Amino acid sequence: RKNRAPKRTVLPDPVFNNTLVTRIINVIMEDGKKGLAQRILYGAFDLIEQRTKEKPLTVFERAVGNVMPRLELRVRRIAGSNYQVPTEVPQDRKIALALRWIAMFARKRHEKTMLEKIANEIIDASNNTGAAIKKKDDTHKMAEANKAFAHMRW
Amino acid sequence: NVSSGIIHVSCSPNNTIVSASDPGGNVLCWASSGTMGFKGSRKKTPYSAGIAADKVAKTVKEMGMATVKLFVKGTGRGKDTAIRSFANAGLSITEINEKTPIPHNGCKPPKRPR
Amino acid sequence: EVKNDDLELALKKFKRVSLEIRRLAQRHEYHLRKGMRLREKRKIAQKKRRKFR
Amino acid sequence: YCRFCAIGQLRIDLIDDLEALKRFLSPYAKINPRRITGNCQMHQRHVAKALKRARYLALVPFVKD
RNA sequence: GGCGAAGGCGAAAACUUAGGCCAUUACUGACGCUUAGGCUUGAAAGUGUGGGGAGCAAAUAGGAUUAGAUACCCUAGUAGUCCACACCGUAAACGAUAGAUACUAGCUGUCGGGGCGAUCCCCUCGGUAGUGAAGUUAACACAUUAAGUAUCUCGCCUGGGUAGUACAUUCGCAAGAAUGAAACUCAAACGGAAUUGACGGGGACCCGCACAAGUGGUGGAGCAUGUUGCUUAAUUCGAC
Secondary structure (H helix, E strand, C coil), X not given: CCCCXXXXXXXCCCCCCCHHHHHHHHHHCHXXXXXXXXXXXXXXXXXXXXXXXXXXXXXXXXXXXXXCCCEEEEEEECCCCEEEEEEECCHHHHHHHHHHHHHHHHCCCCCCCHHHHHHXXXXXXXXXXXXXXXXXXXXXXXXXXXXXXXXXXX | CXXXXXXXXXXXXXXXXXXXXXXXXXXXXXXXXXXXXXXXXXXXCHHXXXXXXXXXXXXXXXXXXXXXXXXXXXXXXXHHHHHHHHHHHCCECCCCEECCCCCCCCCCCCCCCC | CCCCCCCCCHHHHHHHHHHXXXXXXXXXXXXXXXXXXXXXXXXXXXXXXXXXC | CCCCCCCCCCCCCCCCCHHXXXXXXXXXXXXXXXXXXXXXXXXXHHHHHHHHHHHCCCCCCCCCC
């Protein structure tokens, strides 16, 4: 019966001083190693740089912040069915899912180099066009039939 | 137009049916779970009662209402959500009326639900 | 039952009187026998007498 | 404070006790038991008969209040 | 909490009515209890007549699950609910304790009655109960409201399936109930209570990558092997 427990998160990168990009490195690394992911990610900050003149800090923050939920549909089952009760989702899991969704969407639209696509997805999440904002949208819009579930506890 | 009327809500055990009526009990509007799209089984939920009550409160009030009676009948799981919605609707009420069946005895209900 | 008290908390007082009306009328909505009616009523009565008082 | 078998006149049927009945039975239509007012077997049976007769007198409504 | 024989009894009004609770120095005088006889009721189901039926519902129709639903679940409906009439006679009609019977710790009561004061706390006798002494029970426990203990009477049993079966009768307009074997026939127990578990589609309770989040993938496909199968010449056998 696991209870509240801490997490190990690498401290912010000296060149940008953001802990969020560090969790991105934590969760993007191919073959489970940073010996190779960091080069291309710094390239991506560069690609963001000469494309649309977006400084990585503000564009990355405005991309990650707009994909973040506020509702925890806590599971409660009947052993033959299941339902969800809406509580407040934890803030640590808030930022965790935000960064995970940003990273996992960041690497798609298979094309000539991953630099162009990752900068493209950073820009898309920056401009609030539908590529990862849909996560935040659904986490509140599908909690409407589940909003009825907030009238009772089971 | 009309300065006085009534709103009858009925929370039957698995349905929410409501009508806004004239002071002589002549309906000017009505709503039910099916009219909202809750036809079937989701009409027993408090959400259907709350949405029905909100809709009819708006229809009776924005029409030109000042003071209205609220006749609540039946018992379900959303008869309290209904009055909460009326309170949140913004319609003047002097007191909530109780029209629930309160007999000593009477007709015999259906067979034992097991 | 008069509920003309205030403009925002009338339903809160309505809750308790509705609960009383329910608990007095929670047995006339189904078919049943006299024996189980008396059994449940008297058992609930002597159970409330022993725990809450 | 106990209300009957505590100030009880032993004769509670209709004798000018209308206000007491309107206070014994709260305006929410409920006859008080021996568990609150404390009336004895004598007092409680006579109060019950008197109140149901007042119900059959329309002084206190059967189901309204 | 009271009353009523258990059967049961609660919107009221009234009708008649009895049992009853205390105090009756008293009113009499062994009538005191008793069951086979004899005398009555006995719920409800159900039988039948007429109305009447607001209502629902046995059987039944349909929809649902289902291997099917005579099931759970729902929409109807027949009698079934009502009124009076009669019948009905079994019941968890269970003090699972026959009647009355005579008193027996305490205990908290609680109600009614008689003396008291402001209703109250007070004494007493009866109605409503058990914690528990003694007594009595396989153990729980009855225990001042006996399963304690005196008196009498009566019915109910001698292990089981068989079996409330045939037989003969009874009452019952019906439905049903009354009546009750024999043969076969077994070695003790859905025996009874009582201690540890066993599941629970019972709670409560303590933690665990037990779960979730994930990483990272299986499976889809492409390699090598593992098992088993087949098979000839053996594809050795073994884990099930």
